[PDB]
Amino acid sequence: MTHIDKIQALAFSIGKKMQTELLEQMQATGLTPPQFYILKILDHYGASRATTLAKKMYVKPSAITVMIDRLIDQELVERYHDKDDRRVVIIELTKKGKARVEEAMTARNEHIAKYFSHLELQEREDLLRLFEKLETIICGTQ
Amino acid sequence: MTHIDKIQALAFSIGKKMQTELLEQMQATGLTPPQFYILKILDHYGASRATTLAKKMYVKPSAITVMIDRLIDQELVERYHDKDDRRVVIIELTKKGKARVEEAMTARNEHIAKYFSHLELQEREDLLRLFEKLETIICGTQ
Amino acid sequence: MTHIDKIQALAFSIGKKMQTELLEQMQATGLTPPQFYILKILDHYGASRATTLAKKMYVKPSAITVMIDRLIDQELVERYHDKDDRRVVIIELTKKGKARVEEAMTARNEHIAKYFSHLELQEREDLLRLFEKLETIICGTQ
Amino acid sequence: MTHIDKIQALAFSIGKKMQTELLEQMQATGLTPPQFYILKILDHYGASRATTLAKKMYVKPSAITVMIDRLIDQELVERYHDKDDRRVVIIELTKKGKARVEEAMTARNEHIAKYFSHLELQEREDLLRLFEKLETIICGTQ
Numbered sequence: 001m002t003h004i005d006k007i008q009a010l011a012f013s014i015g016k017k018m019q020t021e022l023l024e025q026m027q028a029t030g031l032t033p034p035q036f037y038i039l040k041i042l043d044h045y046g047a048s049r050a051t052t053l054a055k056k057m058y059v060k061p062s063a064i065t066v067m068i069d070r071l072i073d074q075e076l077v078e079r080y081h082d083k084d085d086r087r088v089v090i091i092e093l094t095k096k097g098k099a100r101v102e103e104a105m106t107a108r109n110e111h112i113a114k115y116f117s118h119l120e121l122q123e124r125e126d127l128l129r130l131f132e133k134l135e136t137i138i139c140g141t142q
Numbered sequence: 143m144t145h146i147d148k149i150q151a152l153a154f155s156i157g158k159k160m161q162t163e164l165l166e167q168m169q170a171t172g173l174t175p176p177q178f179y180i181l182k183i184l185d186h187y188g189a190s191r192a193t194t195l196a197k198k199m200y201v202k203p204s205a206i207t208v209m210i211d212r213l214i215d216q217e218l219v220e221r222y223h224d225k226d227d228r229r230v231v232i233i234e235l236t237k238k239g240k241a242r243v244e245e246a247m248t249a250r251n252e253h254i255a256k257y258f259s260h261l262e263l264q265e266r267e268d269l270l271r272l273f274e275k276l277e278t279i280i281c282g283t284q
Numbered sequence: 285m286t287h288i289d290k291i292q293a294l295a296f297s298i299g300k301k302m303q304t305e306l307l308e309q310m311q312a313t314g315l316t317p318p319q320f321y322i323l324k325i326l327d328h329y330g331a332s333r334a335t336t337l338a339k340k341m342y343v344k345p346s347a348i349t350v351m352i353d354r355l356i357d358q359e360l361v362e363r364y365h366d367k368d369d370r371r372v373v374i375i376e377l378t379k380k381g382k383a384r385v386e387e388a389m390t391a392r393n394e395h396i397a398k399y400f401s402h403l404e405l406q407e408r409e410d411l412l413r414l415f416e417k418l419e420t421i422i423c424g425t426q
Numbered sequence: 427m428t429h430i431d432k433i434q435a436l437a438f439s440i441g442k443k444m445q446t447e448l449l450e451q452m453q454a455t456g457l458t459p460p461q462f463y464i465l466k467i468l469d470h471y472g473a474s475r476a477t478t479l480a481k482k483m484y485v486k487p488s489a490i491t492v493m494i495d496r497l498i499d500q501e502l503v504e505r506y507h508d509k510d511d512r513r514v515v516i517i518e519l520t521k522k523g524k525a526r527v528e529e530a531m532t533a534r535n536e537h538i539a540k541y542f543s544h545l546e547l548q549e550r551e552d553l554l555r556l557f558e559k560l561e562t563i564i565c566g567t568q
């Protein structure tokens with residue numbers, strides 16, 4: 001219980017500001033932040049299992065399924081099943097998806113970059129691990 | 143730059159869930175999280191300077207002014223100027239405000255309490271200090 | 285299909301502005317717009333059946349149940365069952381609820397009042413009936 | 427004043443549902459509803475003045491400027507000045523923008539289409555003109 005009400009007070013105020021900036025980013029890139037991060041993973045590691053994407057995002061497989069369905073609508077990734085093992089679902093960046101992720105890189109919201117440049121690398125790592133833990137608690141993941 | 147896109151991906155997903163829970167809390171208590179925290183400060187320390195409230199919330203005086211104007215509309219606090227030093231602005235809980243903060247205590251969103259009970263006290267302290275730093279960066283405070 | 289994309293474009297832009305004003309109103313009154321309207325109904329007609337509230341709001345009984353649970357948390361209404369016919373659920377304004385609705389009256393967002401004062405009474409009636417129809421379509425009500 | 431609180435109650439409930447569906451649409455198409463409608467105008471009439479886009483959206487020129495800046499980030503339109511009259515600002519769909527608007531057509535949110543198919547064409551026209559009037563009142567346009 002301790003620190004909860006103060007954390008929520010700060011999260012509300014920060015979040016109210018961050019939401020405006022994220023709507024700008026969505027307007028400038030055509031992606032929500034989780035969609036963008038998905039594309040970055042696939043850009044980095046190439047074609048990957050949908051279950052690995054879920055693990056990297058700290059969400060359930062079923063949650064990644066919806067995300068991927070939306071990225072398919074935008075034609076940014078392709079989903080397929082391994083030819084012989086149809087249980088293995090592979091997600092892959094399309095040519096469009098690769099161009100979108102690079103464009104999104106350059107069109108990122110600059111106010112958000114400014115705020116986080118005032119946090120040490122080590123402080124960003126701390127926040128990220130706390131968020132990953134919170135996501136795990138919320139989603140019932142590992 | 144490192145960790146920024148992953149942090150935003152997680153913040154978006156967590157925030158989407160947290161927003162639903164905060165709307166419930168607003169419906170159940172009649173307060174946003176910063177308004178509730180303000181009332182808790184005034185319940186704890188009694189009548190306090192508006193500038194001290196601003197410091198405790200990591201926001202500018204001008205930001206606290208709007209918050210307090212809204213709490214005055216709900217009749218939960220009273221604002222007055224010291225009788226001889228009219229530069230000193232004091233904020234005080236009303237009888238209504240005291241009843242509201244106690245009621246809000248009991249009617250807090252239980253999903254949020256559940257999530258944060260899975261974080262160590264020390265992890266809550268870490269998140270809180272990171273949020274206070276982020277708020278300071280965003281608001282241009284000390 | 286015709287007019288749908290234009291309507292959504294306008295609804296998005298209007299809604300983005302209206303959301304800021306509604307958050308102010310929530311801060312100033314401690315009520316969301318449906319909670320406020322519920323209290324106005326109970327102020328006008330006195331104690332009423334929960335099913336009648338649902339009909340007046342164009343929502344399912346189950347939807348009004350959640351709303352009323354939240355108004356009970358804020359202690360603004362009381363729910364009870366008729367003494368002999370326990371199927372009849374009656375909702376009633378408390379002394380607190382009556383004071384809140386009057387206070388909310390005076391603390392209403394003035395920007396919203398300004399916009400709607402530029403619509404004829406007959407245009408407000410048209411919008412209201414279109415919204416009631418849309419609500420009925422969405423909620424599966426009568 | 428009459429009908430205002432009821433309209434806001436309904437707008438809040440409808441809007442809460444519509445927001446979820448619009449976030450899906452944004453995920454599925456990479457466009458907010460005003461961005462999509464802009465692209466539809468440019469698809470229909472070809473290259474058009476930025477001032478004409480503003481008129482068609484019932485917003486100020488300055489508002490369309492921001493929208494267009496975001497569509498430029500996504501590379502969906504091109505802005506240029508007439509070669510001899512540099513006061514005349516022309517907006518034009520790119521090859522990417524044309525493909526995006528067609529894709530967006532097919533990936534539109536089906537729940538929204540379902541709701542509006544239950545309104546007569548004449549009722550959609552009424553809502554649209556009321557929204558255009560409301561937008562005009564809010565933006566200070568003609």
Ligand SMILES: CCCCCCCCCCCC(=O)O
Nearest residue numbers: 020295296299300441444445
């Ligand atoms: C009825 C549609 C609701 C529209 C939701 C728009 C979301 C706006 C987010 C607030 C940030 C801003 O106002 O820029």
Ligand SMILES: CCCCCCCCCCCC(=O)O
Nearest residue numbers: 162299302303437438441442
């Ligand atoms: C046009 C009015 C817009 C209404 C904003 C309501 C905010 C809803 C927040 C989303 C959470 C939920 O759907 O429960």
Ligand SMILES: CCCCCCCCCCCC(=O)O
Nearest residue numbers: 011012015016157160161304
């Ligand atoms: C993580 C918590 C999210 C906070 C949601 C706040 C809603 C803000 C609505 C946008 C209007 C405004 O910015 O004034």
Ligand SMILES: CCCCCCCCCCCC(=O)O
Nearest residue numbers: 015018019153154157158446
């Ligand atoms: C801190 C970032 C805030 C994230 C805003 C996400 C908007 C969610 C809109 C509510 C609809 C839904 O929950 O599906």
Ligand SMILES: c1ccc2cnccc2c1
Nearest residue numbers: 011014015018149150153
């Ligand atoms: C609190 C609330 C929202 C956030 C959004 N992005 C990064 C950090 C955040 C902290």
Ligand SMILES: c1ccc2cnccc2c1
Nearest residue numbers: 007008011153156157160
């Ligand atoms: C990220 C986004 C929103 C939050 C809201 N409350 C607590 C923690 C959070 C982390």
Ligand SMILES: c1ccc2cnccc2c1
Nearest residue numbers: 295298299302433434437
């Ligand atoms: C469109 C979108 C949101 C609204 C909110 N309140 C009144 C009218 C509206 C029209």
Ligand SMILES: c1ccc2cnccc2c1
Nearest residue numbers: 291292295437440441444
């Ligand atoms: C009220 C609130 C939001 C809306 C969004 N889209 C269409 C109609 C609407 C009416």
Ligand code: NI
Nearest residue numbers: 079080081082
């Ligand atoms: Ni296949």
Ligand code: NI
Nearest residue numbers: 221222223224
């Ligand atoms: Ni005084």
Ligand code: NI
Nearest residue numbers: 363364365366
């Ligand atoms: Ni009883």
Ligand code: NI
Nearest residue numbers: 505506507508
């Ligand atoms: Ni040029």
